[PDB]
Amino acid sequence: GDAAAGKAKSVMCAACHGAAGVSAVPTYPNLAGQKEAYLTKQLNDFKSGKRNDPTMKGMVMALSPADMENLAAYYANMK
Amino acid sequence: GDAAAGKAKSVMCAACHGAAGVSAVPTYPNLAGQKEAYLTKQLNDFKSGKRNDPTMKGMVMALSPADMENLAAYYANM
Numbered sequence: 218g219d220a221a222a223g224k225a226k227s228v229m230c231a232a233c234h235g236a237a238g239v240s241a242v243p244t245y246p247n248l249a250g251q252k253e254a255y256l257t258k259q260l261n262d263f264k265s266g267k268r269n270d271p272t273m274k275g276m277v278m279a280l281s282p283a284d285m286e287n288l289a290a291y292y293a294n295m296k
Numbered sequence: 297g298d299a300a301a302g303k304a305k306s307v308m309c310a311a312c313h314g315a316a317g318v319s320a321v322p323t324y325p326n327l328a329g330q331k332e333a334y335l336t337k338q339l340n341d342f343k344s345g346k347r348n349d350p351t352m353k354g355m356v357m358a359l360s361p362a363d364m365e366n367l368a369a370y371y372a373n374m
């Protein structure tokens with residue numbers, strides 16, 4: 218959805234996925250420029266438990282449907 | 297893993313993930329420049345069934361552990 222709203226919500230995400238969506242640790246994925254619909258589905262799937270990862274299930278706990286779309290827009294538009 | 301061997305096993309993967317690791321389709325992820333260790337984990341997780349996606353489970357059933365490392369290195373280093 219809204220890239221700017223996503224930025225506002227990305228401070229925690231940046232600690233692991235990087236300030237510009239490129240991670241510095243090899244087990245944390247890069248998000249910069251990823252497909253927006255794919256990113257949204259992953260966040261939806263962590264929240265629902267469809268994709269089991271204890272760290273990310275925890276990170277999406279407080280995210281609304283709009284928040285996940287917005288975070289996806291923020292990373293997808295990274296160049 | 298061995299990027300060169302990976303590239304040689306990548307024809308099927310390229311059909312959805314793109315010839316240069318950037319996909320054309322909104323629900324298919326880009327793999328280009330992704331972290332090698334992360335990509336390797338996901339492939340192992342599709343094969344073990346720990347990550348559920350009917351399409352990718354299918355795609356990994358034929359791959360050895362080395363093939364999966366090799367594909368990961370191929371995408372990670374492009």
Ligand code: HEC
Pocket residue numbers: 226227229230231232233234244245246248256259260270272273276277288325337
């Ligand atoms: C570490 C403490 C993290 C923080 C903070 C955030 N994420 Fe994360 N993320 C982390 C790990 C270890 C993984 C991989 C899980 C695995 O299967 O090995 C991820 C993965 C994601 C993904 C999936 C990417 C993909 O290519 O499929 C996304 C979309 C993602 N993370 C986004 C994201 C957001 C929006 C965060 C804050 C709200 C966030 N992550 C925090 C580790 C960590």
Ligand code: HEC
Pocket residue numbers: 246258308309310311312313323324325326327335338339349351352355356367
């Ligand atoms: C479509 C018909 C595909 C073919 C052929 C291959 N993959 Fe795939 N891939 C596909 C989908 C629909 C998804 C997303 C599943 C989801 O969770 O929505 C994926 C995902 C991957 C991943 C995970 C990437 C991530 O960021 O976590 C990887 C590492 C991957 N695909 C690699 C890969 C390889 C090596 C392939 C052939 C051997 C391959 N894919 C084929 C769809 C399709």
